[PDB]
Amino acid sequence: GLFDIVKKLVSDF
């Protein structure tokens, strides 16, 4: 999914 990349980002920084 796209938000998956967004969630993997937020969670990181």
Coordinates of N, CA, C and O in Angstrom, one line a residue:
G1 N 0.9 -1.2 0.0 CA 0.0 0.0 0.0 C 0.9 1.2 0.0 O 2.1 1.2 0.2
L2 N 0.3 2.4 -0.2 CA 1.0 3.7 -0.2 C 1.2 4.2 1.2 O 2.3 4.5 1.5
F3 N 0.1 4.3 1.9 CA 0.2 4.7 3.3 C 1.3 3.9 4.1 O 1.8 4.4 5.1
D4 N 1.5 2.7 3.6 CA 2.4 1.8 4.3 C 3.8 2.5 4.3 O 4.5 2.4 5.3
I5 N 4.1 3.2 3.2 CA 5.4 3.9 3.1 C 5.3 5.1 4.0 O 6.3 5.6 4.5
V6 N 4.1 5.6 4.2 CA 3.9 6.8 5.0 C 4.0 6.4 6.5 O 4.6 7.2 7.3
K7 N 3.5 5.3 6.9 CA 3.5 4.8 8.2 C 5.0 4.4 8.6 O 5.4 4.6 9.7
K8 N 5.7 3.8 7.7 CA 7.0 3.4 7.9 C 7.9 4.6 8.1 O 9.0 4.5 8.7
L9 N 7.5 5.7 7.6 CA 8.2 6.9 7.7 C 8.0 7.6 9.0 O 8.9 7.8 9.8
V10 N 6.7 7.9 9.3 CA 6.4 8.5 10.6 C 7.0 7.8 11.7 O 7.7 8.3 12.5
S11 N 6.7 6.5 11.8 CA 7.2 5.7 12.8 C 8.7 5.8 13.0 O 9.2 5.7 14.1
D12 N 9.4 6.0 11.9 CA 10.8 6.2 11.9 C 11.2 7.6 12.4 O 11.9 7.8 13.4
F13 N 10.7 8.6 11.6 CA 11.0 10.0 12.0 C 10.0 10.9 11.3 O 10.1 12.2 11.4

